[PDB]
């Protein structure tokens, strides 16, 4: 478990000016502090920290990784390849655990939503509708953090089962906003919080498809 | 006085002709609209979804073509897949630069 | 049909020549700390505006 913190400073003249003009300045700084805490938690979950020995979901050494041909190459689309790779990932989840666990959720980059909406030839429905018909009980969603998984510009897809016994995140303590400490003519307000990260108890229930 | 067609900060997409020498191509039209609808969502990071589309009145025949081996047209499929968006026709879109160029507004 | 496909408003006076609107922004960060620490980072804010005729 870890601890997070920041602070902000404000003087008395700024307080008077904010009260006079009707646009207070302390509330904006408090909002910035809260946003910084939340964004740090998100960054810890999706990128990790090498010095702190925090490992991201993409860098776990015991999860299944599948190299894939591009779903979009030379500005043309390949829905067939996408469907084949999705079915292969679901089959991998089913096989590697020997039927004990089954895939439930898929996360894809939001820029690949156009590939799965193409109408199949000589019919009135798209690839996504057929896939959902043949794979009842699976949800599909788009996540922005999947637009870059290594810092170099490659994409990826996550197939997993969302159960509390497989993975978890803990937030033992919430944002608190400690009292203010006066000085000569200004103040200082510190803020703290607590978090753990992503804990993966069963690493065989996650498949990452790279090169998408 | 900047217009809706000359503003340098709006999104602009060049495209192949929807009707190239009397050859109507409804497949390209069906792919150019979803791209714009996705662009509006992408560049604003949410908080703004496309609602209205304006097309020249001379191009309603492209969206009325019946898709091969089916009993429905491209317009019905587009409305089924993109429910919540209204399509209207505007005569001002048949000339956007004085040289006969046509345009579509999303 | 310029007045039917676009919104129209009257929040303007007949004797006005210009108008302006404002926008705001913020910066900040956070870190992982120990218990006996007194070097927490800071945050700030700013703004700007644009005009008309």
């Amino acid at each position: 478990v870890f601890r997070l913190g920041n602070a902000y400073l404000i003087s008395i003249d700024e307080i008077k000016a904010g009260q006079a003009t009707g646009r207070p300045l302390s509330t904006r700084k408090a909002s910035a502090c809260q946003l910084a805490h939340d964004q740090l938690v998100n960054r810890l979950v999706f990128k990790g920290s090498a010095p702190h020995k925090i490992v991201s979901v993409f860098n776990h050494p015991n999860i299944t990784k599948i190299t894939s041909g591009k779903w979009i190459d030379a500005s043309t689309m390949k829905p067939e390849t996408a469907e084949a790779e999705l079915t292969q990932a679901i089959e991998t989840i089913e096989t590697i655990t020997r039927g004990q666990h089954r895939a439930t959720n898929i996360l894809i980059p939001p820029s690949m939503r156009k590939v799965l909406a193409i109408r199949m030839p000589e019919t009135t429905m798209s690839y996504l509708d057929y896939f959902k018909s043949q794979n009842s009980g699976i949800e599909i969603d788009s996540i922005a953090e999947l637009e870059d998984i290594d810092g170099a510009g490659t994409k990826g897809v996550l197939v997993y089962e969302k159960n509390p016994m497989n993975m978890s995140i803990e937030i033992p303590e919430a944002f608190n906003m400690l009292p203010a400490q006066p000085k000569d003519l200004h103040f200082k307000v510190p803020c703290t919080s607590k978090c753990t990260g992503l804990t993966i108890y069963r690493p065989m229930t996650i498949v990452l498809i790279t090169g998408v | 006085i900047v217009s809706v067609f000359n503003h340098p900060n709006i999104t602009k997409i060049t495209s192949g002709k929807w009707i190239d020498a009397s050859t109507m191509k409804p497949e390209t039209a069906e792919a150019e609209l979803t791209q714009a609808i996705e662009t509006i969502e992408t560049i604003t990071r949410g908080q703004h979804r496309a609602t209205n589309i304006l097309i020249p009145p001379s191009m309603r025949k492209v969206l009325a073509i019946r898709m091969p081996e089916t009993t429905m047209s491209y317009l019905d499929y587009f409305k089924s897949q993109n429910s919540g968006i209204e399509i209207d026709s505007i005569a001002e879109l048949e000339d956007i630069d004085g040289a006969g160029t046509k345009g579509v507004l999303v | 049909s310029a007045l039917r496909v676009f919104p129209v408003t009257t929040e303007l006076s007949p004797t006005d020549k210009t108008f302006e609107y404002m926008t705001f922004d913020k910066v900040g960060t956070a870190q992982i700390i120990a218990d006996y620490t007194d070097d927490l980072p800071l945050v700030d804010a700013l703004g700007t505006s644009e005009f008309g005729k």
């Binding site: 939340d38 964004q39 998100n42 | - | 006005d16 020549k17 108008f19 922004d25």
Partner: peptide, 27 residues
């Protein structure tokens, strides 16, 4: 020398009621 008018700019200027804020979605 200065050759100006009786009315200044701010007397014929309006501020819109609604402002805008930048968006930073958390995640």
């Amino acid at each position: 020398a200065a050759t100006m008018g009786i009315w200044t700019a701010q007397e014929l200027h309006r501020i819109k009621s609604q402002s805008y804020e930048e968006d930073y979605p958390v995640g």
